[PDB]
Amino acid sequence: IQGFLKNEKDNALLSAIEESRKRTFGMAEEYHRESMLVEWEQVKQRIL
């Protein structure tokens, strides 16, 4: 019961870190993508 209730928790600690990491890193691509698209969402009216 005590190796089981170690491994449940050490996996749960890694999991609690992991979605915070990988959500913040996916949010790095998407932040560049909308920033690129918002500077472009200035430039085409500077053009027009």
């Binding site: 928790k9 749960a12 600690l13 609690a16 870190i17 979605e19």
Partner: protein, 112 residues
């Protein structure tokens, strides 16, 4: 705190099959474009996500993070892990980038 978070993280999703959580997305599927019905906001058990109990559990966890002295490093790692799982109860899920959600205007996104 992990199992509290996991239980809300099924509640949210099966109330998005046979509960109130689907309603503001199910209504978005109607062919209604002039003089709509009213809108009402049901919750039932989903209202418990607003308890005083959940705010008391947040305090008592921060109070214990302050009361644990530095050398209790293994106690502090389980409490920082607890506060991460508690802050997953306060997590918004991933919404789908639909060409229909992209129509909801800057007025609806400020008057919902």
């Amino acid at each position: 705190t992990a199992h509290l978070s996991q239980a809300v993280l099924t509640e949210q999703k099966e109330t998005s099959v046979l509960g109130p959580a689907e309603a503001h997305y199910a209504f978005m599927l109607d062919s209604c474009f002039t003089s709509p019905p009213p809108e009402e906001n049901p919750l039932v058990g989903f209202a418990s996500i607003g308890d005083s109990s959940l705010y008391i559990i947040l305090k008592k966890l921060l109070d214990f993070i302050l009361k644990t002295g530095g050398g209790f490093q293994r106690v502090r790692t389980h409490l920082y892990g607890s506060l991460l799982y508690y802050l997953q109860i306060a997590q918004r899920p991933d919404e789908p980038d639909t060409l229909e959600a992209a129509k909801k205007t800057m007025w609806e996104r400020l008057t919902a």
